[PDB]
From a paper:
Galectins are a family of lectins, which is characterized by the affinity for recognizing β-galactoside-containing oligosaccharides through the evolutionarily conserved carbohydrate recognition domain (CRD). Gal-3 is a 31 kDa chimera-type galectin. The molecule used in this study is a truncated CRD domain of Gal-3, which will be called as Gal-3 CRD here after.
The crystal structures of Gal-3 CRD in the presence of TF antigen, lactose, TFN or GM1 were determined at 2.0 Å, 2.0 Å, 1.9 Å and 1.8 Å, respectively. In detail, Gal-3 and Gal-1 bind to TF antigen with dissociation constants (Kd) of 47 µM and 4 mM, respectively, which showed that the affinity to TF antigen for Gal-3 CRD is two orders of magnitude higher than that for Gal-1. As the core 1 structure O-linked mucin type glycan, an intact TF antigen consists of three moieties: an N-acetyl galactose (GalNAc) linking with a galactose (Gal) and a Ser/Thr residue (Galβ1-3GalNAcα1-O-Ser/Thr). In the structure of Gal-3 CRD-TF complex, TF antigen is bound to the concave pocket formed by S4–S6 β-strands with the insertion of β-galactose ring into a wedge like cavity. The Gal moiety of TF antigen interacts with residues His158, Asn160, Arg162, Asn174, Trp181 and Glu184 via the hydrogen bonds or van der waals contacts. The recognition way for Gal moiety is basically identical to those observed in other Gal-3 CRD related structures. In this network, residue Arg186 interacts with atom O1 on the carbohydrate ring of GalNAc moiety via water molecule W1, while residue Glu165 contributes to recognition with the N-acetyl group through water molecule W2. The Arg186-water-Glu165-water motif-based network forms a unique paradigm, which was firstly reported in the mushroom galectin AAL-TF complex, to specifically recognize TF antigen.
Residue numbers in the entry: 116 to 250
């Protein structure tokens, strides 16, 4: 998949990003990439088949190098099924919920949240909407 949600002003606490769509049939991967220039502040990557195991891989890329992965086995996504991803920005971490249920937390590694200018949305999904607001 290919699509970029511009975040004018960058990421900031109290910001809530909502992603609505439907996972494609025979899906293999999904990915949300919060970017800061060439760096990837927060990579959210559900993998549907890694050695016959489903897993959500989260990481950060700094100076073209991926860091220590943070893996989550709770996997709420289903091929062909609609989904909702919510990312709430906190001063210390990104809080992710899927289908209204808390899923995981990713501590900030990239500290200048204001430089996080956009969110790339890709993978095997049919995007309905990608938006944000404060709460
Ligand atoms: C293709 C692939 O999924 N590679 C993953 C694998 O990389 C090892 C070192 C090797 N290149 C291989 O698999 O043949 O394992 C590493 C973790 O040890 C990683 O999952 C590789 O996938 C990459 O993961 C990062 C996030 O950590 C990004 O999602 C990259 O897009 C992805 O290729």
């Amino acid at each position: 998949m290919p699509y970029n949600l511009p975040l004018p002003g960058g990421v900031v606490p109290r910001m809530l990003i909502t992603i609505l769509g439907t996972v494609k049939p025979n899906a293999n991967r999904i990915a949300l990439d919060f970017q800061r220039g060439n760096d990837v502040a927060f990579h959210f990557n559900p993998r549907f088949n890694e050695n016959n195991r489903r897993v959500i891989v989260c990481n950060t890329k700094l100076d073209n190098n991926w860091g220590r992965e943070e893996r989550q086995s709770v996997f709420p996504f289903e091929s062909g099924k609609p989904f909702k991803i919510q990312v709430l920005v906190e001063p210390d971490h990104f809080k992710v919920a899927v289908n209204d249920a808390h899923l995981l937390q990713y501590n900030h590694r990239v500290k200048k949240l204001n430089e996080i200018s956009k969110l790339g949305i890709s993978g095997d999904i049919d995007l309905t909407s990608a938006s944000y607001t404060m709460i």
